[PDB]
């Protein structure tokens, strides 16, 4: 008891400092950044806010409860106040409440007091200049609080932050005018709590009412604030719309646009994983392997944790349907390994041309196939076994009888033996010629050609268009 009682005081001071000065220096600094320059945007505290939010998402967040200085909620949410020279007095009032909190119990517990608190900014009337400061002062307690998952009486409080964000959405439909240099930070912050829309709604069932609401927000941002807005909202669309049918494959067709410019960073890569599974549902394997590889290869630096391992998991699925895959056991991480353990023997069965080896993988690992969600291609891969199996033996064997190859091709009668190779040439597999009497399959090859034209002529536009973009970057980054 004395140890646990005296170890309570040490923890709070760290949130009492960094959690106090995180939105004070970044948010209060963004106030001066939003007064001037305006360049145009930047607003580097918006990306610094991303660093602080992602910092809280690990440790320590805020609430929950923690029983440490719950008076931080009324601190920033009250006392604009009101015009800038009067706000300076309230900038001293934060220090006044620092002394009040340094004297008495400092209101270490709020809970049901969030009802007057969250409505106090509406009692001030008003900030009135910066809506992102009002939305952030209310959300910063509540957004990390969603990670508690208590599911009692505070879920509707998260919904109240969603209503405050809807007031942020109506103001996202009006002012402008003109260059709402704060709406990019509103795109950032709202995309977060739009994913908190996803989490809080997923506590019970699908959000479908918010699918029409997301389409209302996604379409009302057109065309003005779509920049960096439409990208995050399209992932908010694509993610759960990939979980719930339907039509998103043809919906993103008419939705594009592209939509440029890609922001922010890994956002477009993960979008190419989301739409990567989409474009993989059309089964064209050149665009699917390029969108899946570009999804993972374009994503630094992690941690955390396993979904960046999931894009790598589903990445080589289209490579399994290509007919040739390397053994990936050397790419296993300490985490991704234990997650894909069935998928290991799966791609090992894809390398081999044995049917029973692949079918036993299906019967045993079908439970993990339910966990991943990819099924339909597991039964049709038997056609990849007959095409890779015939690619194997044909190129392999000098002249193979249709009765001897019939074991690995499982039928290979005297009739279909013609089509196996012939319709493989239709798919561009093997050139083997067969004169059918008994018969026997005599595989030869003569090709000397290509390896030339498209690679070098494309490399011209590749390199040139690249260095042109690198011009568009460097030439435009010299403002300082």
């Amino acid at each position: 008891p004395p140890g646990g009682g005296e170890q309570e005081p040490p923890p709070p001071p760290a949130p009492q400092d960094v959690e106090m000065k995180e939105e004070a220096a970044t948010g209060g600094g963004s106030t001066g950044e939003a007064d001037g320059k305006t360049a145009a945007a930047a607003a580097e505290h918006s990306q610094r806010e991303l660093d602080t939010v992602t910092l809280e998402d690990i440790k320590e967040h805020v609430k929950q409860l923690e029983k440490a200085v719950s008076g931080k909620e009324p601190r920033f949410v009250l006392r604009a106040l009101r015009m800038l020279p009067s706000t300076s007095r309230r900038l001293n009032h934060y220090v006044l409440y620092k002394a009040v909190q340094g004297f008495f119990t400092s209101n270490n517990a709020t809970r049901d007091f969030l009802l007057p608190f969250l409505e106090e900014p509406m009692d001030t009337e008003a900030d009135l200049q910066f809506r992102p400061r009002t939305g952030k002062a209310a959300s910063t307690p509540l957004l990390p609080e969603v990670e508690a998952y208590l599911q009692l009486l505070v879920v509707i409080f998260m919904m109240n932050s969603k209503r405050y964000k809807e007031a942020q959405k109506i103001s996202d439909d009006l002012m402008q005018k003109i260059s709402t240099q704060n709406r990019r930070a509103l795109d950032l912050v709202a995309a977060k709590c739009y994913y908190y829309h996803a989490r809080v709604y997923e506590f019970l069932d699908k959000l479908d009412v918010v699918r029409s609401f997301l389409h209302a927000r996604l379409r009302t941002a057109t065309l003005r604030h779509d920049a960096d807005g439409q990208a995050t909202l399209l992932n908010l669309l694509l993610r759960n719309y990939l979980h719930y049918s339907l039509y998103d494959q043809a919906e993103k067709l008419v939705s594009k646009s592209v939509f440029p410019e890609q922001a922010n960073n890994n956002e477009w890569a993960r979008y190419l994983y989301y739409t990567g599974r989409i474009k993989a549902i059309q089964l064209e394997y050149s665009e699917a392997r390029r969108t899946m590889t570009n999804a993972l290869r374009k994503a630094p630096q992690h941690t955390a944790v396993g979904f960046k391992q999931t894009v790598h998991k589903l990445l080589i699925v289209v490579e399994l349907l290509l007919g040739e895959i390397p053994d990936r056991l050397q790419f296993r991480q300490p985490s991704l390994k234990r997650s894909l353990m069935p998928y290991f023997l799966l791609t090992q069965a894809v390398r081999t041309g044995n049917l029973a080896k692949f079918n036993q993988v299906l019967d045993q690992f079908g439970e993990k196939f339910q966990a991943d969600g990819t099924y339909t291609l597991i039964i049709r891969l038997r056609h990849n076994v007959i095409k890779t199996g015939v690619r194997m033996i044909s190129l392999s064997y000098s002249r193979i009888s249709l009765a001897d190859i019939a074991q690995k091709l499982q039928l290979d009668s005297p009739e279909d033996a013609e089509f196996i190779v012939a319709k493989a040439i239709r798919d561009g597999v093997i050139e083997a010629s067969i004169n059918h009497e008994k018969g026997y399959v005599q595989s030869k090859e003569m090709i000397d050609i290509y390896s030339t034209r498209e690679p070098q002529l494309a490399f011209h536009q590749r390199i040139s268009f690249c260095l042109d973009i690198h011009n568009m970057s460097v030439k435009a980054m010299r403002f300082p």
């Binding site: 690990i58 992932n235 993960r270 630096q301 992690h302 944790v305 979904f307 960046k308």
Partner: peptide, 24 residues
């Protein structure tokens, strides 16, 4: 990041090759 997506979730052979001789 931690932002965005990720926080959501013939043998060798020894014996058989030596046996091929004495098989036939």
């Amino acid at each position: 990041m931690s932002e965005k997506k990720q926080p959501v979730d013939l043998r060798a052979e020894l014996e058989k090759h030596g046996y091929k001789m004495e098989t036939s």
